[PDB]
Design an enzyme around this catalytic site. Structure first.
Site, PDB file in Angstrom:
ATOM      1  N   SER A  73      87.793  80.097  -7.343  1.00  0.00           N
ATOM      2  CA  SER A  73      88.482  78.892  -6.883  1.00  0.00           C
ATOM      3  C   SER A  73      89.824  79.331  -6.325  1.00  0.00           C
ATOM      4  O   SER A  73      90.641  79.903  -7.041  1.00  0.00           O
ATOM      5  CB  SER A  73      88.702  77.960  -8.067  1.00  0.00           C
ATOM      6  OG  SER A  73      89.800  77.111  -7.817  1.00  0.00           O
ATOM      7  N   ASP A  74      90.020  79.101  -5.029  1.00  0.00           N
ATOM      8  CA  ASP A  74      91.267  79.381  -4.306  1.00  0.00           C
ATOM      9  C   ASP A  74      91.796  80.794  -4.526  1.00  0.00           C
ATOM     10  O   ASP A  74      92.988  81.048  -4.332  1.00  0.00           O
ATOM     11  CB  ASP A  74      92.351  78.351  -4.639  1.00  0.00           C
ATOM     12  CG  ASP A  74      92.915  78.499  -6.033  1.00  0.00           C
ATOM     13  OD1 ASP A  74      93.471  79.557  -6.391  1.00  0.00           O
ATOM     14  OD2 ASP A  74      92.809  77.531  -6.806  1.00  0.00           O
ATOM     15  N   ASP A  75      90.935  81.743  -4.872  1.00  0.00           N
ATOM     16  CA  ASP A  75      91.371  83.102  -5.153  1.00  0.00           C
ATOM     17  C   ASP A  75      90.372  84.095  -4.579  1.00  0.00           C
ATOM     18  O   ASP A  75      89.332  84.352  -5.181  1.00  0.00           O
ATOM     19  CB  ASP A  75      91.522  83.319  -6.657  1.00  0.00           C
ATOM     20  CG  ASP A  75      92.586  84.322  -6.986  1.00  0.00           C
ATOM     21  OD1 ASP A  75      93.770  83.937  -7.037  1.00  0.00           O
ATOM     22  OD2 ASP A  75      92.244  85.502  -7.182  1.00  0.00           O
TER      23      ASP A  75
END
Lengths: 133, 133
Positions: A93-95
């Protein structure tokens, strides 16, 4: 939103605690990555491209973006395969972590950091400082 | 020179009646052709060259022209072979026919008419009008 003891109005953006945060964030992440690759490939001069197949790709990409009106499954397929060969990704997630061709990137056939900065600027309303990439 | 009935002084140039005209003219013709090819290859931008082998050729050609001081047989050999593959010539005395690659010529890796015009200008003191080529 019941902050303090009174009700306000949330303008937008996610509320990190709902039923599906990490997955929707993953989706949004992949979206931004693909958008940056598209901007990179379309914003490069055509005559400077060496390979015939790559121009063909850029030419028909402009086609399928603006000239066409409905989907074309084979283009989507072969472009997705192209991305899977030149820009492999690992997304939580977002990484993200990206293992990408380097000479293509130098020439401007995939996306480097600068493209991400521009995309975030005009589509996210933030300035991604380069001290964190 | 015994023109009329008096003796003048010939400034230069051939006297087209000696013992070896056609052959020396052939030699001079090949010279101008090779000079034009050299100017063409050296006056082109390096970064625009696609093929690695051709940048190697242009780079080492500048070497063997100005940096070096004496002959280098292998360079001469492979360059002569290069010319024999992408310039093929038929020479009678000052009267030539050339069968040449077309896309190389367009890119600027062999010589087109314009290079001949420039070479004749600064090395022959004449202006070759394009209505005769």
């Amino acid at each position: 939103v019941m902050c303090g003891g009174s009700l306000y109005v949330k303008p937008g953006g996610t509320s990190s605690g709902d039923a599906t945060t990490a997955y929707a964030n993953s989706v949004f992440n992949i979206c931004q990555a693909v958008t940056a690759n598209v901007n990179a490939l379309l914003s490069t001069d055509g005559n400077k491209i060496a390979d015939k197949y790559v121009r063909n790709l850029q030419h028909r990409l402009y086609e399928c973006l603006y000239r066409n009106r409905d989907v074309d499954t084979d283009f989507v397929n072969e472009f997705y395969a192209y991305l899977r060969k030149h820009f492999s990704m690992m997304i939580l997630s977002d990484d993200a972590v990206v293992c990408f061709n380097s000479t293509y990137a130098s020439q401007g056939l995939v996306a480097s950091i600068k493209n991400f900065k521009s995309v975030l600027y005009y589509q996210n309303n933030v300035f991604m400082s380069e001290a964190k990439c």
